[PDB]
Design a protein around this ligand. Structure first.
Ligand SMILES: [Zn+2]
Ligand SMILES: [Zn+2]
Ligand SMILES: [Zn+2]
Length: 89
């Protein structure tokens, strides 16, 4: 994503979080890890490990609602559509 989901500021680096597979600002994403070490900035999920990536290394999904399940290969993001959207309905 561009604007951090927790800070809203323009993400300069893709702070990827696992196993959520969610992205944020690798800067505020690490401050959160140093804060709880296991809570996504917005999903508050067990942040296993945060990693930095380029704003072109993940694939954002845009089907309906706020589905921002990024991935590492269109095949996984495509697999996300048929796994949770299935043509929406
Ligand atoms: Zn931020
Ligand atoms: Zn998350
Ligand atoms: Zn989706």
């Amino acid at each position: 994503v561009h604007f951090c989901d927790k800070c809203g500021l323009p993400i300069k680096v893709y702070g990827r979080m696992i196993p959520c597979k969610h992205v944020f600002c690798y800067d505020c994403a690490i401050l959160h890890e140093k804060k709880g070490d296991k809570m996504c900035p917005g999903c508050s999920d067990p942040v296993q490990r945060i990693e930095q990536c380029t704003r072109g290394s993940l694939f954002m999904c845009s089907i309906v609602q706020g589905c921002k399940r990024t991935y590492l290969s269109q095949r996984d993001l495509q697999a996300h559509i048929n796994h949770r959207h299935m043509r929406a309905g």
